[PDB]
Amino acid sequence: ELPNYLVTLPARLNFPSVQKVCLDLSPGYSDVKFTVTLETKDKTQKLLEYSGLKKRHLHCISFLVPPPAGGTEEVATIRVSGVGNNISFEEKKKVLIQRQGNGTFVQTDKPLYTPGQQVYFRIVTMDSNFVPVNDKYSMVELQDPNSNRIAQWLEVVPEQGIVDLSFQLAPEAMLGTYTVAVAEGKTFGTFSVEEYVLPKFKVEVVEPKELSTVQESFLVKICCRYTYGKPMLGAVQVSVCQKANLPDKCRNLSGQTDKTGCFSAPVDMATFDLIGYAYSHQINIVATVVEEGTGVEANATQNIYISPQMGSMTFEDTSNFYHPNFPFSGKIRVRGHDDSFLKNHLVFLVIYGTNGTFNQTLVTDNNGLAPFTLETSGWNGTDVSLEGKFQMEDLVYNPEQVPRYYQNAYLHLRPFYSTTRSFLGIHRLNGPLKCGQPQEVLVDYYIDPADASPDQEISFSYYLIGKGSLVMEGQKHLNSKKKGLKASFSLSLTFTSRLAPDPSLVIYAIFPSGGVVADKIQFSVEMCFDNQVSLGFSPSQQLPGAEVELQLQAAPGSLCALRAVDESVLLLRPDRELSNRSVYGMFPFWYGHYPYQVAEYDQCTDLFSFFRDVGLKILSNAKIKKPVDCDSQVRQYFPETWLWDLFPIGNSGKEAVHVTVPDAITEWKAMSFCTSQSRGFGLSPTVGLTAFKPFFVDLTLPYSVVRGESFRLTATIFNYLKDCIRVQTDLAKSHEYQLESWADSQTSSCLCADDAKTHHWNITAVKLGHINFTISTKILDSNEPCGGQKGFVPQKGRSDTLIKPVLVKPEGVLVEKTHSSLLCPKGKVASESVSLELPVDIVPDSTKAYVTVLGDIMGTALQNLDGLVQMPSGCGEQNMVLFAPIIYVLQYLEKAGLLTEEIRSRAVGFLEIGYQKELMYKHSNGSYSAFGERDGNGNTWLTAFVTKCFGQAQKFIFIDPKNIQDALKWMAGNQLPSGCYANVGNLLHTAMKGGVDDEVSLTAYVTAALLEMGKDVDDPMVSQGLRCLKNSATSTTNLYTQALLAYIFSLAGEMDIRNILLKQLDQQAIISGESIYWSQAVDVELTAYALLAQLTKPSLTQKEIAKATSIVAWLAKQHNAYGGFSSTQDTVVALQALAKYATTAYMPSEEINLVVKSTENFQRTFNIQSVNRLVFQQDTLPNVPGMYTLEASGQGCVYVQTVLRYNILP
Template sequence: MEQMYVTLIQTDKPMYKPGQIGLEESGSHFIEFTDHQTVEFVNLDSYYQKGIPFTGMLKARTLKREPRKNEKVYLVVNVDEVDTNITLETDANGIARFTLDTSEWNDMVSLTGKFSLEDGDDMFVALNWLFPFYSESNSFLKVQTVAEDLLCSTKQSVSVEYTIDKNELDPESDHLSFFYILMSKGEIITNKEHKVDVPNLPSGPILQGSFNITFSVNVNLVPVATLLVYAIFPDGEVAADRARYRVPVCFDNKVQLEFTENNVRPGGNVNLDVKADAGSLCSVRSVDKGLLLLQEHKTNEILSRVMGYYEYMFEINRRGFPYTIEDFEPYPCLEDAPVPPNRAKRSIKRAPWYQSEADVYSLFKSSNLKVFTNTRIRKPVTCELPEYTRRFSIKDGVGAADRKLDSPSTAPASKEHPVRKFFPETWLYDLVSVGPQGKKSLNLTAPHSITEWVTDAFCVGNSGFGEVHDIRMKTFQPYFIDLLLPYSVVQKEHFTLTALVYNYLNHCVLVEVALTIPPDFGEPRTDIEKSACICGQETASFTWNITATKLGTIPFKVTSRALHVEGDCSDVVLDPETKFKHDAVQKTILVKPSGVEVDKTHTSLLCPTGDSVRGEISLVLPDNVVEGSGHAHVTVLGDIMGNIISNLGNLLQLPTGCGEQNMALFAPNVYVLEYLESAKALTPEIKDKVLNYLTTGYQRQLMFKHDNGAYSAFGKRDEEGNTWLTAMVVRCFSKAQKTVFIDEKHIQDAIKWLGSHQLDNGCFRSVGKLFNNGLKGAVDDEMAISAYITVALLEHGTVHNSSLVENALRCLKDAANTVNNTYNEAILAYAFTLSGDKDLRQHMLDELEKDVIEEGGSKHWSEQWSGAVEISSYVLLALLSGDEVTKKDLELSSNIISWVIKQQNPWGGFYSTQDTVVAVHALSKYARATYHEKRDVALTVHSGLIGYQNRFHVDDSNRLLLQRAPLPDELGTYIITATGTGCVYVQGHLKYHTHPAESFQHFTLKVTTEPDNCTAEAERSFEIHMAVSYSGNRATTNMGIIDVYHVSGFAPVARSLKLLEKKENVKRTEVTDEKMSIYLEELTHETETFSIVVKQETPVSNLQPANVIVYDYYDPRERAEAEYHAPCAGN
């Protein structure tokens, strides 16, 4: 086809099915033909300045994204509901330029680009709305835009036109000052004044003219330069304009990203063309623009490594500045809104209001500039709202428009309309190979969000590096719903569900919306309908008050239909053939039980050898359980590593924001990869996941490196490096080097720093705080750290200073006969295994045998702290890492394994970081030594008391598959029966909530709020105070964590967090949707107080208490719990 058409053909002729000659069907069929030719606006402003000619460009392209040369396109200008059609013709680049007279424009204007003016040809068009730019005196500036990218190492001259009301000028001044700011990447590059002489003002009321601004185009302006020009008049009025210019860096590898459509309906199909030099591998990422409000992409992160600078910037998007610096104001037009007689005045909560007008303030704001001024830069708010809008000002929807669309003649068809429920923040995050042709087309389905998607890519090939970023595509439809609700609430709380209905059509619509209440979720359980009249470019809100009764992730669906009407809906004529516009949105809310979550795990290892073997799992709920919160399931695996492989990203259910915790998540991936490769069980999916974790973990760990090569838990925030963590990094990086790129320099830097702390006797001096002070007293610090560092050096194998290892081994040998604690004996046994010293290895193992604890056929060491897992795992490594693993070694290892796996949490990890790293290493060694064993096991889990039974089958083909089944609410003892040959691992997992226990055996914890009574201010914000001290039998704790769970609808204020982080003992804070975690270096017997200010983000009533938990990171069993109430919880 020559032009873009969507054609619908209806036929009543017989239709034949392929391959079934003689069979026919008849009926009405629609066949759609589409030629994906596109027309789009290029570099178009969203505002116009009355009296200043408006210039713009339309670009026409073919299906292959090539420019349509000498093609007729049409521009439809809609002013005051009157269309003006303008015929344009494209040039050699497919661009048609136009200039419009704005002197008669007063209101919003729509511009539509088309290939045809035929009626109904409006499916694929370019649409842009222009808003009148506000100026008191109709004084305007116009900064020239440039369609092409600016070239590096050139001078760019930009014309600035001005139209100034002479009444705004200072009669005593002979010049007019214009100020301009040139910005890029969040920095002001140039800030200058340009004076225009006006000695003798020409006749007439208007001063018009122009001048040029010239600036150098260099790397400082990459990738986008913003030029803002403004003038301040004596009476306080400001005239301004700004323009943006793209400044690409010239890489040899030319990378291009191009969507086949720049505007796509939600859920629609679109192609993304990725182009680069032949054979290049590209990383493509596309995220919701709204996500950049929280953290802007470091779009030139790789450029910074090449050019030696680093930038971190944010972008202002549709929601405005970050809330810490946003100018929140109450909506001035709702001050006098009536309060329904059945509502308390203070229950009417006003949402933050963002003024979004085309004025000088918006130019500064969109340029990332925060303005402090006494000038007039904002458009005044006009409160003359139509009557139908006022009827919807009240939050609960009372007074909604009376017309409903429920007559039989106009009821919508019974067919289901698509429901929008796919709202990702990150849409694309893929590796794409462009192949020998240098091009790859990705067939995509657009998400359901109404937003703009920001897409970037970088590519590496034979020609080197190249990148492209900030390629944008909108998912939009002119009539849509947005659903606002909290992320989570606690059972019994009341929350407000708000549906915002947007009408970007050019006419009014009569709208009906319906909320579908999920089954068993409060009353009423049927659709709740409301209606309204919404005219073009307007929005209406509909609210429902909901009580959270059912636990879990609950979906809410709002559907709507809209009828096109003429006028203001006062005289609607209904027609049976009326076609409605539809939209439906579904979002979820998490309803949580009150109290503190508790996880209990029971693990059994069953190894039948032909006959059946039995085991049992006992899962019992305590008396103080929160009703309805208990849930249990059973998992079955045929491989000891299966649970770890299934939960690589979640082995630790603890905060993971410091350097050691990052390594604890990094290291297991190496051991998993080694095991799966040896077992020939590595799938592409698991390999991709493991490599992603390793690459991300490696890059993240470098954030904790000191300039001298050492590492510490919080990087340069710590005064000095830490020998334990630095040795741990050497161990982990050494292992990962075989799989992903790890710069050897980072490892050698760490080894060099460790070597600088080696003593004359070959041992090492401990620097920095011990990870786990449970080692102190029971363990010789110098010997423990010396053994740990020696193991790291031996595992790495390549040490430039050979005497470093020789002297370290001499230290260990000298101490071998005097060591008298199990931790040092275990790690020495492993060290001597690695060094090949069989005599000393056996000596250590013999000493360990004297202290072994035997329980029901299993063996382990130490019962005093979580180091029992670490000690037992080092013994396993000593048994399984030698040149030859004997049958006796395997038998003893099996006895140890049967105890170790019982200490696993439901996600495959253990108590803390060190024991998880060492235990996963040991488990992978054991699995590699025994993986050749054939499995064929039938397993039954049953309980005769409650009539429950479930069967599982495990063999070699599914040994890594985690099989899971729910257990009934009537918990108790379950009998496990296994028959066949091989070993299976059965784990029962019970999760429930209890109210905080008043136990201060390990910590004292008191939580209060300020104010402690309900006030108008406390409804919106209050302060949480926590008084904490350690009450255990040590002098101090290890690193401590305080988890402060959010009251529903509230979140911490960023400024409050910054103040908290200034406290000497606070190392870091982290905020998630559920809670805030405070990292403490340690806690002593002296009471410390910590305070946080929280602010309401979403209205929730009947607030339930929230929890505060303090615990020792390295032994989470040492903990204290308390709860706090929002001051207005009972209101």
Template structure:
């Protein structure tokens, strides 16, 4: 009996665990009040680590963080508000991050910029815009910072000047009530009439507000003439509407007369044309309805819209004769006549694309008056041989999704235009031809050495509602090789910025690894409040096991709101004259509220001076620092291949600042900077200067990580170097 022995061997492939990485991310310009954050992330730690972050100025060294980290993935954002307020503000400072364990150590110092002073916005509000001689001017002022928090300090100087710039009143070192300054000033019985100016001097800035003093009669009526902003030369008709109401809301009944004219640009003799007289005018009559409005449809064939000898606008004059009193109310306006019948624009698009992830966005089509055009066919062309036809919806929008797989890392030019309409302005045979304005867009490929990408989707709504939950959808595509050694959970981190400030941060884990899905969509839920309005910039980033940092950013418009809510309403919608009424005010406990009650008729005299949420935002919220005025760090150039420069004398030229579409630029464009040992920059060509015996120099470009470039680029480098070798050899022979 023979006994066989069977040997079975097992081959187990053991993938090495990824090495640790660190990432420090921070605003390049720190606000003077320090109301922002700096964030640290450690990935793939295999042992405990001691971590320290300090802020260093010429006079101060402040420890921001000292932590003993034991987690494999660790993330922390540190507020700088208390720190910045307790140091002498300097123009520059350094962030110093050090970490160390038995096998992993790092130390990085990065320069940051500190604003020298806080920026506030001052508001001045008078109780009404126009005063009669002898009346008392009442006004309030408040200074707010970017968080809409009032400045409680004294007001150094308040001045009132008359129309001749004479100082007629002033207040010094005024103490405010919880930030609100309250003032009154009696006018003389015979003052100079005209525009007066209030000046507030505070926090090194000067704020103006004007009011008018004149003998006036309060208007009894409010008249509105509603006209289209513009019409195109192809429009067959348009509508004009006139509405009139008494200031207490009751509609005015009567008869309206419209006069609509198109003026001639030249004096045309009748012999030239029996139709082309000096002006083209028509009158229309109508009676107001129960709402106090009258509308007329105007047909355009009479006005020769495509004849260039007339001005490209309508002048509209309207007159309403009140029933019973025969009092006349007037209004006037203009309507532009445009040869551009439509305009096509790209919206919700980025200036880069990620190979393997569809490039999405929408095209919008609007008419000459700015209104959306539905049912319009739009052609989107990405290359000469590739186009797509879309039809706009009721909002004048058409969504598109383009496959990027065949774009081959090339710069792509996109165009969108209305089908069947010329795209250039022209005049043929004395007549104006209509045209449509096309849209164009150039997108560049985003660089990733592993071809792994993130893409934040655009919002389905044009405006994100403040203080409401909002879902951010992130598309991802990973290279399987880049995930080798992954523990199975991928950590997605996100930051939300408004202006120069990081206002929100967080992370979300997803089960993505070598055995999981390499392509999909992740959802992150955030609530964007007043501190993120009106423009929230979102950054989502991931550190891959191979040490590559991938990221994407996108800006969202957030509806304007305030952290403290207030409601004000009359208890009765309508009361009789000379009777009492009540106001109901609802606000958070402890709120200081300033009220103003004034006849609506007064506000009709100068409605543009009314305080609004838009005015508060534009004054209190500051401009974003221009990060492009700051110096980017140039990429690191590695030494050349020793064989390529053997027996050669050369000088390495410092590389210039790169503006390539890589993760470093994505982060920089948000006003952020990073300190990290991850890979995030696109390799660039650098230069060597080779010197021969007669000191002539030749620029020989070379690159590192040449595998990241097309083969043709590497061949070009070799050819250029060979040419330089040949030239140097010839020089030696002739010498």
């Protein structure tokens, strides 16, 4: 009757991927040519050109999207056009072509390292379809806790999408959180270096998992297990505390575990006041287990929110909309107070509508599901509401009784836009669907006979849509000779990696009258990977020192990356999560609606809303859019990382290699992820291999022992054979250590089944470094039966020998002498002698000394200065705190040579769009105001601040003159020689106003703000300020005012009254290494203004340059005062101090050949280019402490710091 088209394409186009475009025809046509073209900025390509048929036919194809014109984002138009018989359909819509973000992660082999170990890390980058990419990382950097780049890798290539890089830490690497940052972006991975010892057991809460307010008492089961799965006996101390927003009430439980290793005790509600409004409903169970003999302890903390929820139901599988005059279906998940599956609970159901309120009573099943089917014949196309409750009566809660309530299920249903009386309904598929299994979808339909047109075939077009893109399609054809009967057909679907975790299915049918009948559901698929990889072991538990078979099952042509780590590492620090939820979560939230760039809105629930809720553009002339009204072994091993490997996968898809178990009785958590270019990414579940021995030895020893004390060694012997035995242990005696005559290191003891016994020694360490401790156990034959039975001897593994290292550090208090130098040749050779001297009362073998060369001041945060320009602001005080740092950032960058034209152009565009937003904030008195025209008189601090900003902003963008002169005249009018300052304004932000900002510092700040753009001394508006401030320096009050007075007399051109208060300023400088600083946040302001004062005089000596580098080395470590706009004026003074420092003395490195020499002619040569000048280079000094000469040649300055650490006796 009326022929019509329908064109489907996704909303968000993604450049590295292919997409789908689809066209649906009608009977008729057959001479009108439909072509669809994507008009982008530079060109226009056609998608598909096709002609109509005598039936409906869903014709669709893939395509490659053109690149965006802007580089990362472009709004393109899509246009369908059909020509023929002198008529031409044309219709255009807006789509968005953006470059999608490639998800990058990095993992390490451990989350925790000792000093002296090796850090391996893998960097993987993915598309949104989890296919790996081989783009070039520009720079991988590895950074200290002091934000010093200790390693970098330039232009690194991934193989098969993954790259693995290694770093050997120094054995005196300083502790803390080290960072791996990738490709100069927000992708980082942290790891801690600290002094630890591996724990052998895990304590966990078991029975309190969720708690209810209505229960009377609850059992606490604290249960603790070894890493190899065996229980122990140990003293348990549990604190069960309720906190408050005031003493906190706790109940403390003391106990001993049993043969199952679990400890249970009841706790009553009378301990905790669960009725108090001022008391929190979060209870804290902190358990501490000290196991018997050795005295080593472990913790287990769990914060439980006690629940006032008594019963919760939600509409689990129920559509959001109903068809008029057709039955509605849904099903409700009903849960109790503990989210349990209720046994046949009585669930009431009340509706809300214009016809009235109806009631229904239903009984759930064993799984708590409530299938309900409702008759919608009388609702008559109205917005209805559904409420699933526990009782008909409104719920009454008593303040005297405990808080308890029921979560009633609430839902709002809208009528579907029905211009026809036909029906679609898809039965939902319950819980989380298995990925890759072919699911059967059973859809019911009812075709109206008056809208049937039974002389032609009726077609059903379906799209299965995942992550905002068309995945699979079809058009089921069936005869209209059935006419009107309640029928059902089926669809065979398959969910894969391209499908969402919650993909959607849209089914419609178009009648020749023009009507559409449709239904859309959302599925629920588990987080799936197309590369189905399984990592397995056989026999999956074996004695240590033996070979297991390791099996990868991935797609053929994959590169697998395998990590097998000890569980004892994971008991200290939990590693960063590499699970399927984490990999899916870094691609943000899937494509729910149209973007704001290409959003369509009504100019004033249907199939257009169906394709909007999946984020797909529809173009159709049908009735789509609704009208809108508005035997022995030695156990030496490496118990930190067992396996860290890359494995190619052949054509079989299975790789089985033999790997040897390390000699630690523990559990190895193993995991693997594989990358294939055809199939994509796959992630194995974490499996475990239990390395276990029947009876064995275990040392209890700390990490570091200082030399010459006595420490308690505790060797525990475990027996897990099922009968009583007799052991004989012996500790090896060597010259590395001494013992205090504890039974001559030979004891024999009868130890029974499932039991541990601990021998103690107290040991003096005598030789420095890593020393060994060897102890062995043998089961000897019993001449007499101990315990009533003869001592059991096994057939295999009758002896166990264990060797464990101990780090030994020298005794005495550690003192350090640090010495700084700035070697800056300017075309010459610059040399400097450094003497290493020490008193003669040292402990021997304590003198460590290392030199450090660093080519550039400050580490990562110069790239954070690029991040300071973004997020534009034009409302409130958000603009004035952000317009100011930009000119100082580019002032520092153009004086350091790191300014590029792209960030310059983007920054001056930001200066234009912020410069035009400072004119409506201008006060009516010719001043400046935070509100704009309201604030009273002009604020002296804010007008001084904007004369500071626009006095330096004319060298980048055009600034009008007249604001400077009328602001100058208002400084002349608002200041008197009798009375200066007169602050009448305030900042909009709370608890931060800038500096200390009293009256004398405000006068000093405004008088500093008057000069240094075009002005000098003895002007009329600075003469009254210096008359106010000549006697202000005589007062010698405060520290911020003192440093700012030292700065404002540095710009006055005098050298007599400014150096006299620097003598009382440098003596109170607190010293941290070779980085001296002051503190009265505010400390950065004091150091920046003191640095700005010290580099103002034209005569500069090398002691002042060394003092300036000492200030700058403290300013280099700050990365929150600059790099973020959290402070209104700390960033501007810090960057102008660093910019004036780079003006005066320090140009950064370009090429320095440095060489150090000693008395033993130890010639050590450092080469510093312009590409590794941020790499913190260092080297130890093997020569006995004395003379060291330092000579550098080339262009640039280098910072050379010599640190000598040694220990002395008090």
